[PDB]
Write a protein that binds this ligand. Structure first.
Ligand SMILES: Nc1nc2c(ncn2[C@@H]2O[C@H](COP(=O)(O)OP(=O)(O)NP(=O)(O)O)[C@@H](O)[C@H]2O)c(=O)[nH]1
Ligand SMILES: [Mg+2]
Length: 582
């Protein structure tokens, strides 16, 4: 079935809870402190089922009084639609206004306005109240079918069930396919099961047996069982209020605001780029609300409509998410759209220069935030919740070995590389591949392609060199090696210790001046040839011992050498002796 969450907003004592108890059949406040007073104290839960559309409407009833809006803002955060309640006898009150604005700030677009207590109101006031309300709702750009009900009479509670159903059918639940994200409203411990977290599944779906992360604290846990309204279930979905069994999590360390999350599907940060209508003064500090969690943050103006947020506490948000801002004192101020969470740059300049990109092509703003890195699609989807647009990359960028590199920054460095190299090779025989990292970080993905493009440079061992091929023979260390090689076959250890560098060695072997014979014997090409000719003087008749006498070598050097002649193809080890290949 389909799951949708609605919140109920409304001014205090306007009939919120009483209505839900009659709509759902569920006492929203079931905690006694209500029933003696007659007031809801905190976030409460119920649900209506619509069999004909196969939809469970998940309902969070909110508390009225202004003293409770911290609660209120939390309930409303995750809803898709608002059940706004107005008492005609009172008309439209500031909690009526605040809750609606709040809902608007959180990006809620859908709703039913309820004129309640029709049993306590004569037809006229009913009518003027409705008019008032209509005016109000378009004034706030929040048009809602208005239903007139009496929670008590039961009057057109039906016709409310009607309008809700009509509305639900007009909704699509995009979140079902975003990465799992669940806001936690409670945590507790159940005998025989362990820690349970209860919460509003906001994006994604989660199955029994999935590993998830509780993310202020970072505990990983296999969903052992879970239940939706007292009944065990094996799958939960965005919309559903779900209880998850997560034993690994010390419930006493968990409040609201905690996330349940598909592991490695998010990023923390204390730095955001946002969008508000508000102008936010850098000095005074504002409360920021989201995911049933309050945080506090200082503001730095980047442009107008665009602000930088530094947050007291690291924080899990995605591009597009919406925030509610409160004054120091706790009155409503507005809403904010997270344009970018975890920015690299806090200096204004960079941001204002690519706003036009930041707003309509996030990929290309990302390719800018750090270009050489490139952009993994797996990453875009951790800040966005969505994989990139193949287009927004395509004409701009061309990818390599998986990662996306905007065609721009490649040519920027080829200049910086080649200009550095040639000036470096001016007084040296080369440069550390690591010395490149001092400025370049790790280009190992693409350094190859940089040098695959710049034909001139090849990398040898610990070393980067320009192709200077007649430059080996005028290298002193080379000539040293070549002279030390006149003393017969040498061992790489001695050679290495006489202090000729590996680069010169391997280069010498590459370019056919010396050869490797054992795994560690090294022989000049000159002496190789000399031995070969000396071996040839035996005819093609050619036993092991006959070579030891001809060449004067100990088996320590002979056997790897013959083994090499075999490798080259010069000789064929046909059992006892060897012969010269045609
Ligand atoms: N005559 C009449 N009175 C009603 C009706 N609905 C609610 N009331 C009265 O409304 C008063 C407060 O109702 P309630 O449902 O608590 O509203 P609330 O908005 O939940 N309270 P709070 O905002 O503080 O959480 C109660 O005393 C209730 O009996 C109705 O349909 N008819
Ligand atoms: Mg209430």
């Amino acid at each position: 079935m389909k799951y949708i969450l609605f919140a109920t907003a409304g001014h205090v004592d306007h009939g919120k809870t009483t209505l839900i108890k009659t709509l759902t059949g569920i006492d929203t406040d079931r905690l006694p402190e209500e029933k003696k007073r007659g007031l809801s104290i905190d976030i409460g839960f119920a649900y209506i089922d619509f069999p004909d559309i196969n939809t469970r409407l998940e309902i969070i009833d909110v508390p009225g009084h202004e003293r409770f809006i911290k609660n209120a803002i939390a309930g409303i955060c995750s809803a898709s639609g608002l059940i706004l309640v107005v008492d005609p006898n009172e008309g439209i009150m500031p909690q009526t206004i605040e809750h609606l604005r709040v809902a608007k700030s959180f990006g809620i677009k859908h709703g039913i306005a309820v004129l309640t207590k029709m049993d306590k109101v004569d037809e006229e006031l009913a009518h003027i109240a409705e008019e008032e309300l209509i005016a109000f709702l378009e004034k706030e750009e929040m048009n809602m079918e208005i239903v007139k009900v009496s929670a008590v009479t039961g009057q057109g509670i039906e016709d409310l069930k009607n309008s809700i159903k009509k509305l639900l059918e007009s909704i699509n639940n995009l979140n079902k396919h975003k990465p799992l994200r669940i806001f936690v409203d409670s945590a507790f411990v159940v005998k025989g099961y362990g820690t349970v977290l209860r919460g509003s599944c906001f994006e994604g779906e989660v199955k029994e047996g999935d590993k998830v992360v509780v993310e202020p604290i970072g505990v990983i846990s296999r969903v052992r069982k879970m239940q939706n309204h007292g009944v065990f279930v094996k799958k939960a979905v965005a919309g559903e209020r779900i209880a998850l069994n997560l034993p690994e999590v010390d419930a006493k360390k968990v409040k609201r605001g905690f996330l349940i999350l598909k592991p490695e599907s998010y990023e923390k940060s204390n730095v955001l780029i946002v969008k508000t209508e508000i102008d936010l003064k850098p000095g005074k500090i504002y409360q920021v609300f989201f995911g049933m969690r309050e945080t506090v943050g200082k503001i730095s103006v980047i442009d107008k409509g665009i602000y930088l947020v530094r947050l007291k506490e690291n924080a899990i948000v995605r591009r597009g998410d919406k925030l509610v801002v409160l004054d120091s004192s706790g009155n409503f101020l507005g809403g904010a759209e997270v344009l970018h969470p975890k920015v690299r740059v806090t200096k204004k300049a960079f941001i204002k220069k690519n706003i036009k990109d930041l707003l309509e092509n996030f990929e290309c703003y990302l390719l800018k935030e750090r270009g050489p890195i490139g952009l993994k699609l797996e990453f875009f989807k951790r800040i966005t919740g969505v994989s990139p647009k193949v287009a927004n990359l395509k004409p701009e960028s061309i990818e390599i070995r998986g990662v996306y590199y905007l065609k721009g920054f490649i040519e920027n460095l080829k200049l910086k590389i080649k200009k550095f190299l040639d000036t470096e090779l001016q007084n040296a025989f080369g440069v550390d591949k690591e010395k490149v990292k001092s400025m370049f970080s790790l280009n190992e993905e693409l350094l190859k392609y940089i040098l695959d493009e710049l034909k001139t440079y090849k990398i040898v061992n610990e070393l980067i060199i320009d192709e200077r091929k007649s430059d080996l023979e005028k290298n002193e260390d080379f000539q040293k090696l070549m002279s030390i090689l006149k003393g017969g076959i040498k061992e790489e250890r001695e050679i290495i210790l006489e202090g000729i560098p590996k680069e010169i060695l391997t280069l010498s072997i590459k370019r056919k001046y010396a050869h490797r014979i054992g795994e560690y014997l090294i022989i000049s090409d000159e002496l190789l040839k000399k031995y070969i000719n000396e071996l040839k003087e035996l005819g093609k008749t050619f036993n092991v011992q006959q070579a030891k006498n001809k060449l004067g070598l100990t088996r320590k050097y002979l056997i790897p050498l013959l083994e090499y002649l075999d490798y080259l193809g010069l000789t064929v080890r046909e059992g006892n002796e060897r012969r010269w290949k045609r």
